[PDB]
Design a protein around this ligand. Structure first.
Ligand SMILES: C[C@@H](CC(=O)N[C@H]1CCCCN(O)C1=O)OC(=O)[C@H](CCCCN(O)C(=O)/C=C\CCCCCCCC(=O)O)NC(=O)[C@@H]1COC(c2ccccc2O)=N1
Ligand SMILES: [Fe+3]
Length: 177
């Protein structure tokens, strides 16, 4: 039992796709330099720590996806599989049945130069609620003012206000591996 109110997912027509997506070049570690979405909330009192997401291409060309976060003095690892979708740069979630209440999952790479930065859009339906987020990925933990403002502009263009747009604080634990 619950009640909740969410900013609606934008139509997919407002979400560009990186042209000529190169899956081999997108591999490796990305830091989450910026975070936005309808279930993302700024918390000034206990700000979000930076985490990292590693993309490894398997032999079948799906990604093994591992996220690592520092929490409760430990490194927590989350693993999922991204299965190539309708066009290059889009993915759906492998083994969706193993996740209760999850009926829909989409990933679209919005833009990337592969060696410094990226913006990725995620949309899912979980317990019948439609969630979305955008990640600003960094090859390093810091990015230019220009790339952060572009990320803000894009997030706002999808209906998100500033208090749904977070810039996680760089840390050293867990994510420098
Ligand atoms: C626990 C707690 C705090 C936490 O540490 N969350 C992290 C875990 C580490 C990966 C980053 N991330 O998105 C988190 O949620 O999170 C939660 O209880 C719930 C419910 C949890 C349900 C399952 N879930 O949301 C997952 O994300 C499951 C596995 C994550 C690995 C997949 C690859 C991640 C790539 C995307 C990325 O780079 O961020 N999820 C969330 O709060 C966040 C906020 O919005 C979303 C979300 C929204 C739309 C689409 C995808 C989403 O993950 N998840
Ligand atoms: Fe999540």
């Amino acid at each position: 039992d619950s009640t909740s109110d969410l900013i609606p997912a934008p139509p997919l027509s407002k979400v560009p796709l990186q042209q000529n997506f190169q899956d081999n070049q997108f591999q490796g570690k990305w830091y989450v330099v910026g975070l936005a979405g309808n279930a993302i909330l700024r918390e000034d009192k206990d700000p979000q720590k930076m985490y990292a997401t590693i993309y490894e291409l398997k032999e079948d060309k799906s990604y093994n996806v591992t996220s690592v976060l520092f929490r409760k003095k430990k490194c927590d690892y989350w693993i999922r599989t991204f299965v190539p979708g309708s066009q290059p740069g889009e993915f759906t979630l492998g083994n969706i049945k193993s996740y209760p209440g999850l009926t829909s999952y989409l990933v679209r790479v919005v833009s990337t130069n592969y060696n410094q930065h990226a913006m990725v859009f995620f949309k899912k339906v979980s317990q019948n609620r439609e969630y979305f987020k955008i990640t600003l990925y960094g090859r390093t933990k810091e990015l230019t003012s220009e790339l952060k403002e572009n990320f803000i502009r894009f997030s706002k263009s999808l209906g998100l206000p500033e208090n749904h747009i977070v810039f996680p604080v760089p840390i050293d634990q867990c994510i420098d591996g």
